[PDB]
Amino acid sequence: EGREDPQLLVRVRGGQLRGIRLKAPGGPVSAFLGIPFAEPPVGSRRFMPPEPKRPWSGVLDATTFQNVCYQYVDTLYPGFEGTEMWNPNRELSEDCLYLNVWTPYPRPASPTPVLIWIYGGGFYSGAASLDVYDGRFLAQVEGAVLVSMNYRVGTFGFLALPGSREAPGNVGLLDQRLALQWVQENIAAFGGDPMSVTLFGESAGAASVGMHILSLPSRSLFHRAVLQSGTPNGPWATVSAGEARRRATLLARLVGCNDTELIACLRTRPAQDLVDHEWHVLPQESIFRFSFVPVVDGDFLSDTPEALINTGDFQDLQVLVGVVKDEGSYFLVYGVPGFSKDNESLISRAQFLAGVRIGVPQASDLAAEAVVLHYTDWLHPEDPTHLRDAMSAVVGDHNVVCPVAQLAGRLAAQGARVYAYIFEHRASTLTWPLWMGVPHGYEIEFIFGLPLDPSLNYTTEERIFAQRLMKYWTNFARTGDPNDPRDSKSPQWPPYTTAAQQYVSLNLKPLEVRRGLRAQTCAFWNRFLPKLLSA
Amino acid sequence: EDPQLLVRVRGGQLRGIRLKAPGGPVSAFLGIPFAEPPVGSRRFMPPEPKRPWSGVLDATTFQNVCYQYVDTLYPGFEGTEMWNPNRELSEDCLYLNVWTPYPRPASPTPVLIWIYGGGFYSGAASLDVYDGRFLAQVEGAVLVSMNYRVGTFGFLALPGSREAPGNVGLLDQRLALQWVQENIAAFGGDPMSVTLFGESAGAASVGMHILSLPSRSLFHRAVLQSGTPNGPWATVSAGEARRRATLLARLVGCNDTELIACLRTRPAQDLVDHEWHVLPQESIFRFSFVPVVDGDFLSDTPEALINTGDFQDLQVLVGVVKDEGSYFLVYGVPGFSKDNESLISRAQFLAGVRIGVPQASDLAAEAVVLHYTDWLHPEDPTHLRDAMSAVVGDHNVVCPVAQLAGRLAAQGARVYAYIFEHRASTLTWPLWMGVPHGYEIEFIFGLPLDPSLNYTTEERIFAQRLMKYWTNFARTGDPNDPRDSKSPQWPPYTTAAQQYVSLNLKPLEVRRGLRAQTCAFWNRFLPKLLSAT
Numbered sequence A: 001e002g003r004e005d006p007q008l009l010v011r012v013r014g015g016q017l018r019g020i021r022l023k024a025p026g027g028p029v030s031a032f033l034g035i036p037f038a039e040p041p042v043g044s045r046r047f048m049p050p051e052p053k054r055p056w057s058g059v060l061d062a063t064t065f066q067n068v069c070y071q072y073v074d075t076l077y078p079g080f081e082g083t084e085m086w087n088p089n090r091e092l093s094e095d096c097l098y099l100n101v102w103t104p105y106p107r108p109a110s111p112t113p114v115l116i117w118i119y120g121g122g123f124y125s126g127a128a129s130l131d132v133y134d135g136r137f138l139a140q141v142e143g144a145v146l147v148s149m150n151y152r153v154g155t156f157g158f159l160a161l162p163g164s165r166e167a168p169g170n171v172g173l174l175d176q177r178l179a180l181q182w183v184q185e186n187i188a189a190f191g192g193d194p195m196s197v198t199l200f201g202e203s204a205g206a207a208s209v210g211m212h213i214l215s216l217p218s219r220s221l222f223h224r225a226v227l228q229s230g231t232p233n234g235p236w237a238t239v240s241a242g243e244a245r246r247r248a249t250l251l252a253r254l255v256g257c258n259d260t261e262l263i264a265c266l267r268t269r270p271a272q273d274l275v276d277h278e279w280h281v282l283p284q285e286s287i288f289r290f291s292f293v294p295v296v297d298g299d300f301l302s303d304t305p306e307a308l309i310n311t312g313d314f315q316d317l318q319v320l321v322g323v324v325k326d327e328g329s330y331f332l333v334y335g336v337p338g339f340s341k342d343n344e345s346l347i348s349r350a351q352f353l354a355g356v357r358i359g360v361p362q363a364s365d366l367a368a369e370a371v372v373l374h375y376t377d378w379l380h381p382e383d384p385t386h387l388r389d390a391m392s393a394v395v396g397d398h399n400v401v402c403p404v405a406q407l408a409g410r411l412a413a414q415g416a417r418v419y420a421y422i423f424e425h426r427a428s429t430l431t432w433p434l435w436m437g438v439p440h441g442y443e444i445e446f447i448f449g450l451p452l453d454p455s456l457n458y459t460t461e462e463r464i465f466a467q468r469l470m471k472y473w474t475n476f477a478r479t480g481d482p483n484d485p486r487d488s489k490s491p492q493w494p495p496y497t498t499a500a501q502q503y504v505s506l507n508l509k510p511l512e513v514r515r516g517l518r519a520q521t522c523a524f525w526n527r528f529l530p531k532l533l534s535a
Numbered sequence B: 001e002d003p004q005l006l007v008r009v010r011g012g013q014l015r016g017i018r019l020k021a022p023g024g025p026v027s028a029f030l031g032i033p034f035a036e037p038p039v040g041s042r043r044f045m046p047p048e049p050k051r052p053w054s055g056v057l058d059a060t061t062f063q064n065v066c067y068q069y070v071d072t073l074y075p076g077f078e079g080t081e082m083w084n085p086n087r088e089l090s091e092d093c094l095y096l097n098v099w100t101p102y103p104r105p106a107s108p109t110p111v112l113i114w115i116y117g118g119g120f121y122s123g124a125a126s127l128d129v130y131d132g133r134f135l136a137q138v139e140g141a142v143l144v145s146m147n148y149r150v151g152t153f154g155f156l157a158l159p160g161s162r163e164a165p166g167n168v169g170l171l172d173q174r175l176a177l178q179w180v181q182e183n184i185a186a187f188g189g190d191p192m193s194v195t196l197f198g199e200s201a202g203a204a205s206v207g208m209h210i211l212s213l214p215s216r217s218l219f220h221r222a223v224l225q226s227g228t229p230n231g232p233w234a235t236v237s238a239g240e241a242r243r244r245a246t247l248l249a250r251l252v253g254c255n256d257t258e259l260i261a262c263l264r265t266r267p268a269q270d271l272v273d274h275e276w277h278v279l280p281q282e283s284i285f286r287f288s289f290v291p292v293v294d295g296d297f298l299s300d301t302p303e304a305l306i307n308t309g310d311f312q313d314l315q316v317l318v319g320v321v322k323d324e325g326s327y328f329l330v331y332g333v334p335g336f337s338k339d340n341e342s343l344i345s346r347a348q349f350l351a352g353v354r355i356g357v358p359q360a361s362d363l364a365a366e367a368v369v370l371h372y373t374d375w376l377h378p379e380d381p382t383h384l385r386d387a388m389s390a391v392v393g394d395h396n397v398v399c400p401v402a403q404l405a406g407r408l409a410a411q412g413a414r415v416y417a418y419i420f421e422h423r424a425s426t427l428t429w430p431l432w433m434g435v436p437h438g439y440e441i442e443f444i445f446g447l448p449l450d451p452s453l454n455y456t457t458e459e460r461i462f463a464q465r466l467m468k469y470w471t472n473f474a475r476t477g478d479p480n481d482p483r484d485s486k487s488p489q490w491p492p493y494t495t496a497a498q499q500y501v502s503l504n505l506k507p508l509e510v511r512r513g514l515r516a517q518t519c520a521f522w523n524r525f526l527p528k529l530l531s532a533t
Ligand SMILES: *[C@@H]1O[C@H](CO[C@@H]2O[C@@H](C)[C@@H](O)[C@@H](O)[C@@H]2O)[C@@H](O)[C@H](O)[C@H]1NC(C)=O
Pocket: A337, A338, A339, A340, A342, A343, A344, A345, A346
């Protein structure tokens, strides 16, 4: 120490850190990347809850992202930007429990509201180090303190033998919770306010946020939450104990392995062997379904997300929730025959009915026919364009839009302040075909402020749009209200209520208020389909 | 003695009456016996042809109304009373009426045969709304209407028995159709151009004649207004008919011969008094004694026969009014009245659904409620009221119509479809009821052309348009004016395009898909849900 930048040296509970001055378009930011928040969950620690990081000696270099948690790498369209943007950008390792902090430079003078990002990727993938999660624009433009953590995914994070000591399940969620605890203890060192912490995440990340809302030990660790295209309730975000046990014990067989013996044997297996087999344990040909996800354990989750949202008191909570225009389309090209990024994906009626079975894999025959009946345009029942778009809607509505509608409704009925959005702008830079619309995940780059980087080739309107979104999000973090307190001229974003069911459109035009989030179709999924299942 | 009013038919001579239509005179021959009075041992039996008569039979007056239940819900209210018998009740009621131009047509004229509705338990060809003079004067039509037995008298069945075979009210209709074939040329009618039209239960009757081979040689084209042979109310199975007749016989104090013989001893009103007590559930748009799938008149269910029939040489005009269900709500569903806005609660909506869809399981009724609830306005009483009407209308009329139209079109029939959306300015029902079941008839028959009735001038012009569609249809099987070169045209209904027209005060508008999404629920999904359960 002595010749370095004095404004980049910070101490946390575990010791000294040296960060890096990053260039954001408007000026410098401080980044502290690859901060360990847990003991490496390796060897005998695999499948186990994380233990806090033991203090280090000396100055830990925090200038580069750390390892990505061991994971499956999607190889469907090799070298295609649309798929590669989500793939690991650092070495895959089980030694991966590290977090990242961005702050203004120099660090804020007074306690600053903190945003904690939890990435998505089906609970089998993702990294806090991806370019779309770059906290420098929020830090620089909004003065935000931004934190993102890595958490264990796939088997390493979610393989459970429920009731066991050695693989109790949900440890990827405990990884996240430990980062939240780390922020509570340490964020003040960076100028962050531990008394104002907002969780935000997308897809599996948003399910994860919602699970922290529903899990008491987490509720002391944050104040507001944003759920983007994901929910703890719904068909994909959790599995019963029995189903987790079944999947884990099948995975075990598939790799050559009393839970103690089974688990001991799984711990002797190469990380890649587990990854190579994880996808093989799904009970049906599916899309938008993932092998190793949070388990209703009677611990982290004391009951099903459905039951917990229905009976919970959510008085002291503000939540921002929303969806993109086309939640389902991304998933079609990965498992539904007739669908491709490289053509118009105009499908036949036969391909529609096969796709409903894949998209709603838990459905009986009658339930599947109810879905088909509902989603068919009976004026044009064989029209390939309508069938393609209805297949998309089926998947989007079932997995995202209607779970989101359900969550916003239950939360608002029970005292939470809720704000709802539909994100409808398709990035001019998008590499997916037009038919896919505004796919799952393609709002993130705007919320994080990437269009502000002149080297990325977004339009001027997209720059301004991104700035708007950054304001909503940081205004919400700051106050639990995304509206500008100053700006009475701009259109206002009303809270979502059960009575009026209001939400706003997020696109290049000013905020437009709409009513009912697929109210008619979501009654099908949320009220009728359950009753039809049990019959 | 006016020679225009003297006609010889196979049974003998008839004397009709010169009636006045606003345009000029018409010849009416009313109260012509087409059958032996179905009295005594003939009760419940098929009709027999009327024996020849001596001298000149007086046909200047409507005959008696077939014995039936008279409605008492709103006594002396024109909206209910206009359907009530307007001549004396009698089992001796098998008579028919013929209007013709005056002087009678110079050349063979297309015949329209009206079959009234009234749920198979009521109705008469003598009601003012079925008055054939306007069509005869203005359109030059030969119009025929018959009485046919209704209620237990027309439809009580002990299927398999010789003496209560079921379907005799339909056999009455058929006999009148045979009468027209044998006799109509004497009035100037063309027996080679006969068009059946009817409404509600009369439209279902028309559809049954389409589905029964012996009837098919007796007509060439058909119009079904607000009713179909298929659907939840128009027919019962043989088992359910047997059970209903056995219950009724039990109720009045009565081996089939023995049971039927005892029923024939009972005064007519004793049967009517217990008619309504044999329904399996509390319901609306459900009727006690209706056509029975006997394996004879109906060789299979209307559903089976429409699915598998060959309808190549047939033209059909089918349609519905804007608010098929509203009428039925005041007759069984709590919270509904003509005397207020009938704004209902959610609880009253679920209860109404069990009554409106009486055959529904808990789960099926829940599907109905969930489909018809506006989830933006779940508890809005105006929405719940209109949805209740729609449930009844769709279930009983709109969706059966769409189903029939589609099967007929797919199987070779030339089909035209309409929705009728003009509410008479003279209607005595409240506004919330909209355009109720039955309230297009007065327009088709041309009553607005009568200045004394106080319809608006626009309604007279509209009634004239409709009379033209119906008679053009009768003449040609195409309702379009053959020398009207701007319109636009009324296209045939097909399964691909599903085109139908709106009939209102504005020019024809073509629409596609007659409640397509909702009727898929009723026509495709419900059958699978009830059966599976
Ligand atoms: C659209 O693409 C699907 C899969 O593509 C395979 O990839 C595409 C790009 C084709 O060009 C061909 O090489 C392969 O079939 C097909 O399943 C689907 O049928 C395609 N749509 C049509 C009819 O071209």
